[PDB]
């Protein structure tokens, strides 16, 4: 429910009625397919909270 923007060096996800930068997590994105059929793919990282919060 957003659009992927980039201020030059970091990518984010904002709603398309107001600028609100948020980190690209596994909650505002859904996985569907592989990175070959899409036209316009960009390499980045999807920070998940599970692996960090599991470290104890």
């Amino acid at each position: 429910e957003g659009v992927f923007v980039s201020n030059g060096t970091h990518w984010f996800v904002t709603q398309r009625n107001f600028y609100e930068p948020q980190i690209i997590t596994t909650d505002n994105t859904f996985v569907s397919g592989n990175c070959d059929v899409v036209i316009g793919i960009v390499n980045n990282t999807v920070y998940d909270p599970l692996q960090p919060e599991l470290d104890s």
Binding site: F30, G33, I39
Partner: peptide, 10 residues
């Protein structure tokens, strides 16, 4: 319809 359909059958 989601965006994956349009992005895979553009």
């Amino acid at each position: 319809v989601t965006q994956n359909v349009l992005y895979e059958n553009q």
